[model samples]
Target: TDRVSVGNLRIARVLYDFVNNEALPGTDIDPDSFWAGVDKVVADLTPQNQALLNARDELQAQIDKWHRRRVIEPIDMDAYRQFLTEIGYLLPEPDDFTITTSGVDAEITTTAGPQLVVPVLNARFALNAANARWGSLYDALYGTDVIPETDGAEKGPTYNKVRGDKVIAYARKFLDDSVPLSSGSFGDATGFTVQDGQLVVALPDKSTGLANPGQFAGYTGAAESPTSVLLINHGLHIEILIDPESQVGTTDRAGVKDVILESAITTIMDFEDSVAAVDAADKVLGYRNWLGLNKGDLAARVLNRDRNYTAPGGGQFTLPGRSLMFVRNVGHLMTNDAIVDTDGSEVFEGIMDALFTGLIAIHGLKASDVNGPLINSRTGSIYIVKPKMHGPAEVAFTCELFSRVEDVLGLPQNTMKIGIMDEERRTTVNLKACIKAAADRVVFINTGFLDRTGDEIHTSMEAGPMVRKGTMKSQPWILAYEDHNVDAGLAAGFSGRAQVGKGMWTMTELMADMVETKIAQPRAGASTAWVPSPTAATLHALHYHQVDVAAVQQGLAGKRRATIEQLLTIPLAKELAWAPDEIREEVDNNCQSILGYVVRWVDQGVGASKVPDIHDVALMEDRATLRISSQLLANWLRHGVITSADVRASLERMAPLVDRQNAGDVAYRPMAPNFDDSIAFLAAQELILSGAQQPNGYTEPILHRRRREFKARAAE
Candidate 1:
């Protein structure tokens, strides 16, 4: 497609047509004015963006020099830190102050629950994430191993009474724990009724009510006889669907059909690591879905039926049917051919995202302005999750661009709220300053371990070989990293003002392990953490109910559990006496991960999905996962722990296994027998072999170029 040259910018025809024809029709500005405004914003901010990137490179070069000098000797940790401070790699801490961001929805500020990050390029996945606001606990339990499938409880088409009983018992325990009865257990109840605006349960001996009667919020049907009972705990809703005739309900004693948990309080429609958006068509697809969401329209739209509830005070009201949406923009590192500025240089993708997603959200803002509601953000604000930003300087640049975008779009100032991803080493070390830079616009801050580890390995490449990937989490650096995220957010007054979030549960199928383990996130005072799917969200929501995050945050405010020195401790391995098998094992596992994930991204244009690991267990594979695997291998190579020959052998062996793992996909291209010509196989090699050359050890630059090469080869 030929480019659309408007003023000083040349936009890709498809992207330009999309903004004019599909994206802008429902919102405020016309096509011509929008392009003109984009032209001016791009001109004003492109230079600033370039200068910030130069600053980042300067710091990295300086850091590399320091580590190179200390390559053979044990580093003088004090001098290294002092050198960084002198070079401004770490900035001073900002004075204690609370974030002043306004217009953020309650799902972010007041409630504690699971948050989802989905690839918006896929309409189905995007719709699933938005509709994950509420999910059934019965379904979440029946299909997963949360309730073991033994004693005739194997999950199948044949209904297993044992499984249903287990599911029912588990749900009843939730009710007992969340809203307990005064005299008996929930299983002891025979029926439920509303008498005098109170949920009265008919027991074998006598009628009983909730121990805390105020936990009952509302009901769906009449007060005397209700279809569902809605209760509130920690600002999240629990709806008990009651039906005598339903198959699952008939299996239960009280005719309880299902327990609906209001899960996925907010979802990040991701355009960053989880997405492989390389060109105009890819960007347009994501933008189109975002526009549909803001307009309450999609090709495969799911608008949950509004639950009309009669309140405990006997009044009618409706709860929102979908989760609040946060559209995640790409980081500063990547640029796209979707738009080119005056010198034919690709405009920064993050800048384009800020303007376009903000423009699309105006559809929702205007919809809510007219006493009508769209599927997302009713608060007249747009939530943009900006990922991989380095430090306070980059954050300030983002805020400045956001201001210019608002001026161009004619929206109110500070209408765009930021969710800062604290994944970079610089950002994590100076988080307080980073937050201060966007204090008025910061709505969320999260810790991602994989990207953080990737950056950790890449930053200290010359400090010595790093520890094994599997053991990285147990290191003092990571322990301090995870703890300090909570300490910093709580210290900055995130309680009731913004989200202190955690990373994703990558094991989508291991709900049993997740249910047993993921509670630590909520207990750690994280108001929200990431989950993979709607089912995962439903299962994860139970953790929020079990722990009151707000109370935890209250207890943790300004509690200094982890020190800055602990945070700065490098994870360099103390010894180099690993056996051959140990080295090979690390290589094979990491090689498998890189090949399995990179194959789909390059060959099939798939951004993110579940890729089978070396042990046949599937984990969600995104660019963050790839970055860790590749950077670790590169670190080993830099320290001579593994040779180029060793890595190539592992990649060559894993390629066929990855091909076998993907045999179910009819479109998969095998790398065996023709490995030299396989663009994806070579791409994986590029990631590991050249990982040290990448900026901050990011995988996107190589993956994007190789994916484009694959596309061109296919065309030929």
Candidate 2:
């Protein structure tokens, strides 16, 4: 609520002071020049940003009209395609061209591993993600559902040696499979040492070497008896921590305390879907955490230091101790009070994010070895993932905005790189053109089913009733959307140079299931996939070792698994319909999930969280999840699948269920019994009730307004 007038702009004191004092201290840009430049750029770019948003609505109206007409008559594919192209909702594809991006860190370019997306507003979570570059295979397996807990192997409060054995055995098997011995298995080795620049495995009677000796990358101590051994596999590192005196190592044949896998090669420090930064103070907190990360001052403990290694021939080398961070900036839609225009209106949040996040990361670009462990980009580039953008025009606008910020900050031409989120329907339909818009600076592109499906339902809201929400994945559009994301990336020469990513594994408690199935991402030639936590990152990293994405990319050359027609095919329910009981069940599930997530976001300012569904499965819910659930209910309501009374009935019943789910959390406020005054319940109802009118069926506007109201009420 504390605002300060800085020249022509009314800026929040926290934000203004953070930029002028903390973010600007290490950079060479002057405060006056910075403010002046930002003000001019925001003014210059505001109209164009508004126009693109206007175009989005314009396109959506035409789409809704077309679908409305199709509801009466049979849908015609040719006419639909023509209508889209004519309206510029779908642009013609670009000819063959490679991304001209250079100076990308290996995390984006060469490595294929897990990527963690954490809200930057939470300092501890952000710090943990940054330090998640290397995760313990032992811990990742021991703690999660990766290992079966049956037969006395349950992970109780204290140590479970049975569970411990399973973890050790699993880790040893990983070493055996990934970096095998010349003669025997890792389980048979009594000790490990290096000889003649080679890793030697000691057995009771005989000594063995690596099956592929080149897997021996480095050692941390003397060759006669190394303290830690680093093995390289598929461009990722594996560190075997050896210490006989350690707790777990004392029982093992080899003194291996832990096997640390190079996990979460990249991380998206999110300010978007996972964050609840509705006001200036929230934005300033996120900005401060991001700035601290860039300055390496955020990692107060030994976290920010690099992992030093002794090369095979006694040369010294170091790997970064943290994940390569890509700041996920808010998209074009939201406006914030972090800075307001002279006309008493808020400016675009994404523009401010581009300027401020770019300014803060200047520390990474201009900083030297003085901050040893914290340097993010080895190649002098700032990576930002712009979410919720529409087609090529918005992508072009974002790139243009980045260029202006670059000039304002006196950075190089392509120093500010963009990672396009291919989650919007128009962008997915016109993906190549979208990529072409930022080809010179595009470093990443990925598919997320949650947001993409939300757009799909909303984009075709008038195309009759849709399929059951559970069956959305099996729809033609969803599969092609996922495949074409990889196809578009490969067609644009993303191999070994840029990231072709995939979506998150939403069920956090099912690492065993995750390990069982999530490998399809890498097998589909994705360079990276999203994981909810560091433990998931560690478990997901094993998939990369199993499938070399570079080879997969080469195998997939010139292979296009998706087409424009396939992407445009709506997942409409035809003939086969849900029974009354099924409809009630579906509505209740959607309503419960909506209430579960919105309550946290609105009441507690917790953006992304593990929300329990009606079935009691905890899903990692965010705005994306809310968009789909709300839009589905709205669509079902529009097409007579459910009545307005039915929707309200479910909401009333589900609110209490959700409150019961969160009963133990001390900060929770029950939505029931006080439903007349509950902002969260009202926000949830508004989301579905007004879903058709929302821009792209986005939940941001409602959630932000409700959160702001909640904050004001609490402050009062």
Candidate 3:
């Protein structure tokens, strides 16, 4: 790898050329000044970044000592609280203040819907996520378990009319519930027509209008017999496409072919937990895709087999080809060799991400003749989700870094909006302060249970044996954490000005369960929640309509806030007595999950995907999932609930099972045939064995090292 020196810092040649020739061309920024400014930010902030990380370790050590001293005794909650406050781990609450962030797109501010996070290294997935802003509601319902296949409605090579009928009936009921007709039901309607800018449902006997006529926004084609009717509710648009000549529409009285809902209003093009960019090449791949996306010329060539479906007019079509993209930069934890400092050491990946990703976004911010039709932020702002910060000080550091980048790029102040991830414990406990740290630039704050639970175990590893992974959800602290995120967001006046988000529904195949259960997120006052796919986003969008999020936020605004004590409560098991079978079951489940995800991550550089669990059920797996499983096993091992032998045996036993699970994927390299030789298997083993030493219980240190080794071996 070649290097380029700018002032005291040394940059990788690939990245240097990318910034100078590609990123700086459209923007008015000069290459020399840009590099010099970047050099200054790295020099000034790198020490503070290390200091924040050191603070994380120091605080964890104190917490570990406190717990170890009380190992034989019951925890004194008052003493624990006092000790935390004394160490400055728990700071006093700030005076009341509201976020005044401006220049935000409606997607992050007023609109409430589903959000998608995709690995930007994979161009196809990136394009799909970008284009997921609109999806077919009818397709969403018909393809998933939402329409039960009990009555000969099993989906097959050909369209199942039985399932199609159920889909239509379900969509009709949704319309009746969301935008009701004045007299007759949508099921009984013979046709749809617009009269005097109002939607009229024509029945066999008479014509009726919407109960709320204002829901009808516009129509395509003639008003008397339109091809599609556009409806709006709760700030989301719904398009009802009519075509009697189509297969499903011919069977319906209303000639309705599909119902397209505005889905995935905002997507996070992840460079963090869901990405495997350890070196310059991998980082450059991700950066190039991001550059294309920002320039609105990002396109992925899809194979015939990979194409999900054909267009309504019977030709090939593209998936979500564009979406409002927010680049999720690496947190304050990991470093990458993509750009090294003058001493030849790895630079903090987060700092490099802030400079390069923010700089690349200047192309999108500035208009040019070369820029194509696709535009991400029409509001002239850049959205970046900063993850894994420990507390308010770290967030302040990120805000300062953004300001420096803006200065170098010669952009307006606050042009870079921040999304605060409420994943770490310190961030959760002092969430309001964290938001206040970047108050003028905050656009989003969301809860993540996976990493949060992982941190829960690691922060209190010496406290006691942790409860089962499945039981973490029922823990009082988990409930408090979820509620506190929404409460804090609303308290900061985020109701209609910014998004109060919830975590991802990991089970992609269980759409029916998602439809039944995910409504709770909106009901709980979350303006946006993560969905795994565009189809899931469309289905999840239905939840936004059922409960008006803006109204829900208003109702929740007056409610009592959750307490810090509850947020700090450790989820330790009351008793460590467990049956052998129960222990085996838990270890096997965690091991299978770890191997299933890590193999793809280490060997294939896949950051995120749907991996099957022990029960052969497909679930969305990422680094967050790995963190919880590995940290839980490490905690149990440290507490004598499980031994090194037990964990090793579980991994050995689950290897072949994981191999069998991925038998269908030809590109998959089997872990069983040579388990010891497989870098991924060793990586998984090290994650649990050495998990206690990982800073803040992050999986990145091990995953990145192993991935780099794997890439090096391949190169050799």
Candidate 4:
């Protein structure tokens, strides 16, 4: 690899060229000044970053010693709390305060809907997520399991009219529930026309209007015979498309073809958990895509597989797309070889991301409407979601780093916004302080069950064996963690100013179950929750309309918050009673999940995918899910519930099942007969066996090392 010297730091040639030629062109920043600023920032922060990481290791060691000493005795709550405070694991709550963050877009502030987190490494997925701002309720319902294929309404090669009827009926009911008519149901309407800014519904006997006429926002075509009508409810927009000539509209009484719901109001273009960027070459691809997105010129040339497809202008085709993006940087723990200091050590990736991503985002800040639509951050701010910080001090370090980046890039202060992920144990317990650390720039704070559970198991590995992974949702700490995240965000004045979010709906194929259950997130006072796909976002948007999240937050103000005692309560299995088959089932389930995800991550560099579980259910698998599964098995193995030999047997048995699951993929390399030769299999095994020793039980270290090895072997 070619290298360029920038002061005391040596940068990879690909990254250097990207920064010097491509990223700095449209911006006011000079290449020399930018490189100098990066060098200064790296030189100043490297030691401080190392010190903070050392603190994490030191604290973990103390906690492990304390737990080991108490293994034989029942835990004393008061003593444990005192010990934590002494080591600064628990800090006192701050006085009542509110965030002063300004210049946030409506997507983060006022809109309450589904938020999508997609892998930025995949351009198509990233574009789909950004364009997911609008989705068809008809298509979302017709395709997913939400509309069951019962009776004669089965989905097949041809469109089923019976299934179409069910979809239309369901949509009509939704309209009736959300934007109701004054007298009759939407099912009974014969036509829709606008009169005096009112959505006039024409029935067989008479014309009626919306129950609340103010819900009608505007219309696209002539008022006498509109092509589409726009309505607003709970701060979200819904567009009703009418076309009598369209296939589904021809069978309808009102000529309604599709109901487009405002979905994925905010999307996190993830660079952290959902990507497999292990080196300079991989990092540059993600960085280049982000630079393109910022400049409003990011276009992916997609092949046309449909019959007789042509371009919109005329010829045989390709489609160009982009999305409103928020770049999620790696946490403080990892380092990258993309740049090295004078001592020949890899620079911290998080610091590099903060400096470089913030620098590239300067293009978006200067973008104009004449160029095209300004695709990201119209408010002249860059959204950076910082993951895996341990506590308030780390959060403060990030805020300070952002401040330095802004100063160096010649951007205004607070131009970089922060999204605090309440996933780690220390951050969850000290969430209020963490938010307070970035009060002037904080725009988002959310809960993540997978990584949080992984940390939970690791932090208390000697406490006892955890209960079954399936029963984790009902655990006391889980409930307290979820509730407290909202309580902290609301208390910090995030009600109408910033987002208080919930974790993802991992069951990508279970839209019906999602529709039935995901409403709890909005009702629980979260303004936004994570959805896996564009279709899921459309369906989850219904929950925002059904329950006003702003009102929910209002009612929740000053309510009783989850206590720190409850938040710190370890979810340990008090009873070790289980049949041999049940124990085997648990081990196999965890092993299968670990193997299913690690295979793609290690060999193919696909960070996130829907991997089939032991029951053949496709769940969205990422490193976060892998972390919890590996940690759970490690915890069980630490105790007598499962042995190392038992885990090994499960992995050996599950390997063949996982191999069979991926048989349809031509790119897939099998792991059954040559299991010892499979790098992915070895990585999965190491994740479980060494899970207890990983920093915060993170899966990145093991995954990155093995992936780099695989890449090297493949190059050979």
The TM-score, computed over Cα atoms with residue i paired to residue i, of candidate 2 is 0.98
**Clashes per candidate (backbone, < 3 Å):** 0, 0, 5, 0
lDDT of 4: 0.87
The deviation in Å at residue 466 for candidate 4 is: 1.4
Candidate 1, number of clashes: 0
Question: What TM-score do all the candidates reach, one by one?
Answer: 0.98, 0.98, 0.96, 0.96
Rank by lDDT, descending? 2, 1, 4, 3
User: In model 3, which residue pairs have backbone atoms overlapping below 3 Å?
Assistant: 130-322, 130-323, 131-320, 131-321, 131-322
lDDT of 1: 0.89
lDDT of 4 by residue, 1-716 (tens): 47899899999999999887777776767788989999999999989999999999999999999988765556788899999999999988899899999999878888888999998889888767877877899999999999998968899999999999999999999999999999989989899876665678999999999889888777666678888777889988787888999999999988889998888787888889999999888998998877766766667842111112222122343222223467899999999999987788899999999998888777766655422234467687899999989999999999999999998899999999999999999999999899999999999999988889989999999888888888888899999999999888998899879999999998999999999999999999999999989999999999999998999999889875798889988988777567889999999999999999999999999988889899999898578988999999999988879888999899999999999999999999988878789999999999999998898898999999999999999998
Candidate with top lDDT is: 2
TM-score of 1: 0.98
lDDT of 2 by residue, 1-716 (tens): 46776667888888888888788876778888998888889889999999999998888999888876654555688888999989888788889999999999878898889999999998888989999999999999999988999977999989898899889999989888899898889988889888999898998889999989999999988899999999999999999999989989998889789999999898999999998999888999899889888878785443457889999988999888888889999999989987886787998999999999999888866455433236888799999999988889899999999999999998998899999999999899889999999999999999977999999999999888888789998899999999999999999999977899999998999999999999999999999999999999999999988888899989999998988889989998986577899999999989998999999999999988888889999898678989999999999999899999999999999999999999889999899967869999999999999988899999999999999999999997
Better of 1 and 4 by TM-score: 1
Which consecutive 10 residues in model 1 have the weakest lDDT in total? 366-375
lDDT by residue (1-716, candidate 3, tens digit) is 47887777777888777767777777777888888888888888889989999999999999989887764566788888999999989988898899999989878889899999888898888778777888898889988998888859999999888889989999989888888889878889888876665677898899999898878777776677888877779988777889999998899888999888888888999998887888888888899999988887776852111113222223333333346779999998888877677678788888889889998887776546554345567788999999988889999999998998888878899999999999889998888899999999999999977888998888999888999898998898999999999989998999879999999998999999999999999999999999888889999999999999999999888565677778878888887557889989999999998999999999999888889899988898679989999999998899898888999999999999999999999798889868789999999999999999998889998998999899889997
Return the lDDT, model 1, position 654. Answer: 94
Candidate 4 collision pairs:
none
Instruction: Give me the displacement of residue 184 in model 2, in angstroms.
Output: 1.7
Candidate 3: list runs displaced more than 4 Å.
301-322
